[PDB]
Amino acid sequence: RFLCGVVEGFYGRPWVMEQRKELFRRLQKWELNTYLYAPKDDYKHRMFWREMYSVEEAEQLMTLISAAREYEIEFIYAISPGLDITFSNPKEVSTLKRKLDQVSQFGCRSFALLFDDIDHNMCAADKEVFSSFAHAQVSITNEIYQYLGEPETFLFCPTEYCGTFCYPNVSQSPYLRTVGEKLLPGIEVLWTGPKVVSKEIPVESIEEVSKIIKRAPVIWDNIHANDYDQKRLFLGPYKGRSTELIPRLKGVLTNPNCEFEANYVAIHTLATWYKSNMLYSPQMALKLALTEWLQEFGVPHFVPGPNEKPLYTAEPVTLEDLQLLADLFYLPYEHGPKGAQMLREFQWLRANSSVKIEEWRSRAAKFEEMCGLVMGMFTRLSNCANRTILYDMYSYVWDIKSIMSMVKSFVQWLGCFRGGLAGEFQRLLP
Amino acid sequence: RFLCGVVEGFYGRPWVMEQRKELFRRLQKWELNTYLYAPKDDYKHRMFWREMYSVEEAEQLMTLISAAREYEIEFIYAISPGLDITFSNPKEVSTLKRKLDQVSQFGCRSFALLFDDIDHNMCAADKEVFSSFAHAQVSITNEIYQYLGEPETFLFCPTEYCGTFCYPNVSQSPYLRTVGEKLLPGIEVLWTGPKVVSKEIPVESIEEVSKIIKRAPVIWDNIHANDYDQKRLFLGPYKGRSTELIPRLKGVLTNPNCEFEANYVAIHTLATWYKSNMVLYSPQMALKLALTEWLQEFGVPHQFVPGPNEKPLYTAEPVTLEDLQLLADLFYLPYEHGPKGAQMLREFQWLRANSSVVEKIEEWRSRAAKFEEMCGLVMGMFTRLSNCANRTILYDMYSYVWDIKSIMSMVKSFVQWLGCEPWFRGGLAGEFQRLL
Numbered sequence A: 001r002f003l004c005g006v007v008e009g010f011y012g013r014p015w016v017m018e019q020r021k022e023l024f025r026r027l028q029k030w031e032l033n034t035y036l037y038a039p040k041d042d043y044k045h046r047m048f049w050r051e052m053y054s055v056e057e058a059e060q061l062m063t064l065i066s067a068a069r070e071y072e073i074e075f076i077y078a079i080s081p082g083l084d085i086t087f088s089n090p091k092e093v094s095t096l097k098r099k100l101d102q103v104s105q106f107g108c109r110s111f112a113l114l115f116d117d118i119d120h121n122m123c124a125a126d127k128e129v130f131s132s133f134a135h136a137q138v139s140i141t142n143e144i145y146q147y148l149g150e151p152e153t154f155l156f157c158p159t160e161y162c163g164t165f166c167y168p169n170v171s172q173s174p175y176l177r178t179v180g181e182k183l184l185p186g187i188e189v190l191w192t193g194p195k196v197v198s199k200e201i202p203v204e205s206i207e208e209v210s211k212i213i214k215r216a217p218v219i220w221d222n223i224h225a226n227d228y229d230q231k232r233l234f235l236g237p238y239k240g241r242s243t244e245l246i247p248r249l250k251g252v253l254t255n256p257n258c259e260f261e262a263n264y265v266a267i268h269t270l271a272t273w274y275k276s277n278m279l280y281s282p283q284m285a286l287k288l289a290l291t292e293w294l295q296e297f298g299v300p301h302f303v304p305g306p307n308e309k310p311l312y313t314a315e316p317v318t319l320e321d322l323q324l325l326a327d328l329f330y331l332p333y334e335h336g337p338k339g340a341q342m343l344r345e346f347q348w349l350r351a352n353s354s355v356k357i358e359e360w361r362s363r364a365a366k367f368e369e370m371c372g373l374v375m376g377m378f379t380r381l382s383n384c385a386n387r388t389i390l391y392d393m394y395s396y397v398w399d400i401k402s403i404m405s406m407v408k409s410f411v412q413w414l415g416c417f418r419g420g421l422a423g424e425f426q427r428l429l430p
Numbered sequence B: 001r002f003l004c005g006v007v008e009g010f011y012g013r014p015w016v017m018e019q020r021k022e023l024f025r026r027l028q029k030w031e032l033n034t035y036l037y038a039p040k041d042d043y044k045h046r047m048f049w050r051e052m053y054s055v056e057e058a059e060q061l062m063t064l065i066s067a068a069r070e071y072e073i074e075f076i077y078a079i080s081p082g083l084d085i086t087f088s089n090p091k092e093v094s095t096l097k098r099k100l101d102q103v104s105q106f107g108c109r110s111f112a113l114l115f116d117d118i119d120h121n122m123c124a125a126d127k128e129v130f131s132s133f134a135h136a137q138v139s140i141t142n143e144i145y146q147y148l149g150e151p152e153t154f155l156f157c158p159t160e161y162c163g164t165f166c167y168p169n170v171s172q173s174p175y176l177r178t179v180g181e182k183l184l185p186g187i188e189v190l191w192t193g194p195k196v197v198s199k200e201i202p203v204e205s206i207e208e209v210s211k212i213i214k215r216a217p218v219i220w221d222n223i224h225a226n227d228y229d230q231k232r233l234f235l236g237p238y239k240g241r242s243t244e245l246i247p248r249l250k251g252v253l254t255n256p257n258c259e260f261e262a263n264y265v266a267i268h269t270l271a272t273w274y275k276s277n278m279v280l281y282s283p284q285m286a287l288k289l290a291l292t293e294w295l296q297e298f299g300v301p302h303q304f305v306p307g308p309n310e311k312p313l314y315t316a317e318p319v320t321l322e323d324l325q326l327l328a329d330l331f332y333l334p335y336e337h338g339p340k341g342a343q344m345l346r347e348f349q350w351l352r353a354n355s356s357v358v359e360k361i362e363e364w365r366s367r368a369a370k371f372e373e374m375c376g377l378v379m380g381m382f383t384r385l386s387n388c389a390n391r392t393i394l395y396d397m398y399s400y401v402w403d404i405k406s407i408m409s410m411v412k413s414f415v416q417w418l419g420c421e422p423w424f425r426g427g428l429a430g431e432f433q434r435l436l
């Protein structure tokens, strides 16, 4: 009973109901099975966790939950009361149960209590009735598991959800020790890897955590999350997670890009990786993902003479175009092959600038040609028929086209306020 | 007859019909009078200028154009054919004519043709039939003006639509000379001033262009546009345009931020500037007037009281005027940070340079702490924005305020460290940008 799919768990503009339904369509298609509802800035999920859904909100959640049954996706409703709750106060515990009862009434079987990204300092009144912070969470958590009659699927995200976040370390964490002991064994535990956005989730780290968690954890994977850096998109494939981890985990839910339509690769290649050992090749999973993704660009959501201006809209998006895009907007820790290369070629064309000086002039002329592929990719994308995809990635495609059209003017100049205030500070740090 | 209002004229996700109706309501409330429709990447405005509106698209346009009439806002439909039209071919001219006649039947009485951000190089058949790019544009433009019955308002936007873009200068541009000579006299010409994004629009610069084009232009103002730089947002006031320009202009249409709800200040301050001259206009007082009005929208969607022993309500403190004054100073104008933003940059420039002395080590200890306080007001500003009841405004600004909150907290912990991986910020674009 392995939970594998998508947590809508990021900061900023949540997905709307139309997009979530369509995500169910895509999860079923690729043979994944779980959706965790946890959008940090959907007001009633965290900031106003006490507030009851209105009739209109109730109706849209009922329809969305129905839509998840219709596509054989398990809908897990998460709630985040960490910022605000007095755990010792029973009227608070009552408020949380009322909120979770309304959601069961919408036809929701599965649930989650998240405690991630809050400070570990309790109030005077919780300090009295509870030993440590973990104790207070485990109490509230278990009592809710039980009140809801021990559902099959009931997740718990600890405040210490990655390696780095464990004080003083993983295996001697007194917050985590208490989670493995006092928290009921039917409740599952969420974990992001060594770090918040793990580069790798190695098997050593999962055995280690399991030992003190005293369970196989559900992985909350932030590998493709772009909520933390305005300029960054992640179109690269699932990587740094081995097929070997599947038997050591109760599940893997990926928290991908804020822009819905850019999670084709992230959610596709994750399915390639799950099929693999229910072995896995990143560079092949991606070509598989990109080839199918290319299908959507041509579906919405004169034949000029030899003396006449040719059609600007003539050329359509091509698997090469998309392959470049993905290399430009790859992963949180490596650029794609063509990306890291364009970069190197620029570093050297800048250093060895030479006022056998021919190795340069017909080497930075292969660059003026490769900078024109970035420009070509934007122009064809700006003309594609699926405007929904374009709009979702417009800001990012424009940005990289702009920096490469300025890097071009430069690496062809050597032969003859950008970012606002945030930028001016950035350019004065490390 | 002065056209003052908004042009939806920018690259990227256009506004949806609900937002446009909301715009007309705001324009009327602030006593502005014009909307120019020209979204670079709305489907059938530019790339697919030729295709006619579906029956569904036609219903939406008609509802929008009636909404404009109901709100006493002039609706100007613009089209951008110059990427791939052939100007000599009377079938291409007939397609353009068809497109505009369709919109005319939707209720539209005002039109525009735009020839901006296309390359200068014509093709063979056009080169044969027309003397210059200007000759071709003036030709099909004058035709269309006359076909639609010489409507009271019809705009032209040149390929050479600012100073930097005129070859080889404004005064001696043969392109603009052709436009001023040939282009019919009842058509108005749009101008972005000395630059695409003009810091100032000096009156001298309006008399210069007015001569080579032989009329008072209509400004297309890109002062608050933010399509060109992913990290930028402009919440500062209308600034750098004398009220002396008004009597020397046919109008001002501002092309503001992509994010609809970030344009309260941009549009509100333009209104104040316009209305001040129908020292008349202070940007700073315009800005306070706008943020004061804007603040009221924040606590409106688009009980347990804890004891002294218990955890207080995270969501308790609502957005203040001082929070919005800080936000605007952080995201001000294209060529100027606001006072608090410049100040915060100055005290950090200095704490970094005079770092050694950690005597004058009595000063630095004070300064670094007053700086930690200010970084604190940026975090507090984020926290209260993310709790506000208007999730629509929050969503449009989220990524901007998240970013300045996260950079100020990096900077704050660098200044703390000097007194002693979410956290390669920018991706690939980043690393290329750091070599220029």
Ligand SMILES: CC(=O)N[C@H]1CN2/C(=N/Cc3ccccc3)SC[C@@H]2[C@@H](O)[C@@H]1O
Residues within 6 Å of the ligand: A009, A010, A011, A040, A116, A117, A157, A161, A192, A196, A220, A222, A225, A227, A228, A255, B422, B423
């Ligand atoms: C349980 C979990 O993954 N929660 C978060 C983690 N995270 C972030 N957290 C905030 C943070 C900022 C700076 C440094 C560390 C942590 S940002 C990316 C992701 C965000 O999508 C996600 O909901």
Ligand SMILES: CC(=O)N[C@H]1CN2/C(=N/Cc3ccccc3)SC[C@@H]2[C@@H](O)[C@@H]1O
Residues within 6 Å of the ligand: B009, B010, B011, B040, B116, B117, B157, B161, B192, B196, B220, B222, B225, B227, B228, B255
């Ligand atoms: C008449 C007019 O303003 N047209 C355009 C100009 N412009 C831009 N031009 C593209 C450009 C990119 C790079 C360098 C120079 C120019 S971006 C801002 C604005 C954009 O909103 C607007 O539609």
